[PDB]
Nucleic acid binder design. Structure first.
Length: 75
RNA sequence: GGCUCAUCACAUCCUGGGGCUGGAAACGGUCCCAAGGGUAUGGCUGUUCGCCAUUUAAAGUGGUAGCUA
């Protein structure tokens, strides 16, 4: 599923900061990450293989680029 | 898909005038009175907490949609 993050170019977030921060979770591989779309204040990042909800309910409180952020289903 | 949003918060930094005073000078101190302002733009192998580059007088952290090639 597509996830929203209140982070983007203006918080100096990049596609990698996600890719790196996510893969390092027992249960998730880098192949599970679909398209990532950085924007001004929001990033879209797609999860594959139904591993969406899990990631989501784990990202809720994890330092990405050293800054926990709003995450949840895109919409 | 191009340019245009903030108000705040704790910071932090840049820019005066005037009496007196230190000092051989260069440069300072002190007291009185200020008025404003900056903290930005862009790069980097799609395994994160950075790195780098300019140009800022002054280069940080946090809270939430319009005019047109």
């Amino acid at each position: 599923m597509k996830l929203y993050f209140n982070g983007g170019k203006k918080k100096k977030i990049r596609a990698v900061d996600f890719v790196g921060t996510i893969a390092k979770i027992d249960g998730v591989s880098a192949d599970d990450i679909g398209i990532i779309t950085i924007m001004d204040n929001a990033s879209y990042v797609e999860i594959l293989n139904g591993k969406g909800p899990h990631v989501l309910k784990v990202m809720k409180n994890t330092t990405v680029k050293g800054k926990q952020l709003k995450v949840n289903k895109a919409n």
